[PDB]
Amino acid sequence: SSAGFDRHITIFSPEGRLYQVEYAFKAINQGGLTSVAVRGKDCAVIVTQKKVPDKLLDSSTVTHLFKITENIGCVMTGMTADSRSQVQRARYEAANWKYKYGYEIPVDMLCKRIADISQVYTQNAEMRPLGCCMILIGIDEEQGPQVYKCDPAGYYCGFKATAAGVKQTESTSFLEKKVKKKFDWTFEQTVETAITCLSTVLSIDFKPSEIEVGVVTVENPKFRILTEAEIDAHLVALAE
């Protein structure tokens, strides 16, 4: 139900529901992207892609991979405009904890301080909710890797493997049955299952240069990603 000018501002409804906030559901659809997170025993792997409508597209500038900390990176979805304003805020509080605290960052609770600023965006009188979706990995001491996916409702969320977005609903359906049962996860096992979980959705299966696979594993704790080299080798390894 709606009464008066409530349609024209951001507030509750006569039935207590929300409209603006729920219109942010399809705010990701205009971008038309997908991100799925898979975590292993000692490793965590992110899979993403990008669209190249024209040959003028630069691989470096249109790169959707964002690196917050040397040890901990991230990725976004939806419209990339709202994501960049959240990038520096994820870098800001990062450097605040590196400066003041001086250690490996709130690998668990960092999503609370980020969603707090994300809630301030939603809690403001008249301002854009910034429907960009934040996704983080994590590295801790003897806790193994961590995976966290935050949504711009102002709440903290993260788990072993989580995929949320346009087509990510069908991707989690395969991950529920793939993880358990009972199974372990190795380095290449999580990279190979990053495509198979999306294989239940679309997976046009074309040249890997367009798709970007984020990977973090504990040998040297610093997060990093290769260029085009062995990602194609992991793509041909999963298909025998």
Partner: protein, 240 residues
Amino acid sequence: TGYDLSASTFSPDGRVFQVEYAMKAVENSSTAIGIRCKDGVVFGVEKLVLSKLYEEGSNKRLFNVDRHVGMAVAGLLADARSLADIAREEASNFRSNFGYNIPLKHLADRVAMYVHAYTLYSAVRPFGCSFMLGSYSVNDGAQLYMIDPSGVSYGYWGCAIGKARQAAKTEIEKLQMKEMTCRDIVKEVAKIIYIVHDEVKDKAFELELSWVGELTNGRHEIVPKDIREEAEKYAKESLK
């Protein structure tokens, strides 16, 4: 029914009507394009003629923000000079606290955080200016970035805004771009510039061209008509 009123609110289709009206607001303005060669970056601006209108070489949309950076802008002209002073003041803060050339990547990022912010609040309004950012340096090289009123930061080898002709960027792939030294590039772009955008819509017009790169040693200035003169020299004989 009024969902386009507040710029802080979403829409029933899950996007920003204020930006959708801002995207086509830049399209009604005259065409301003840009392209980058290997050692340089090229800018261009079309100047429409209706009655006279006034003195030639007036209110040109080509502006110079910094030593190595320049502005090719389209849309409402007063909103462009405001962003020209903001980019000038931002370039003043970088040359002060640091004292070297501002990288084009983060220079576009600072403006990306601004243009994005004005779209979030219903108090202020979005921007009707879509401009082009490009630069060249000895330690950096030639990059070109395309900024849109929605606040998305990115760039290609080339882009086109303003009027919808878009055929002036077609012949560029028929000519040598990254291979050329940026010298003959000036006169190679202007061929179809005259051909297309037919005289039925606007009887007369005028063309501006600007370049920055190695030949100027990183400096940016509008290429004079008398020197090297081959700009409009080859443009008149290439119409067939």
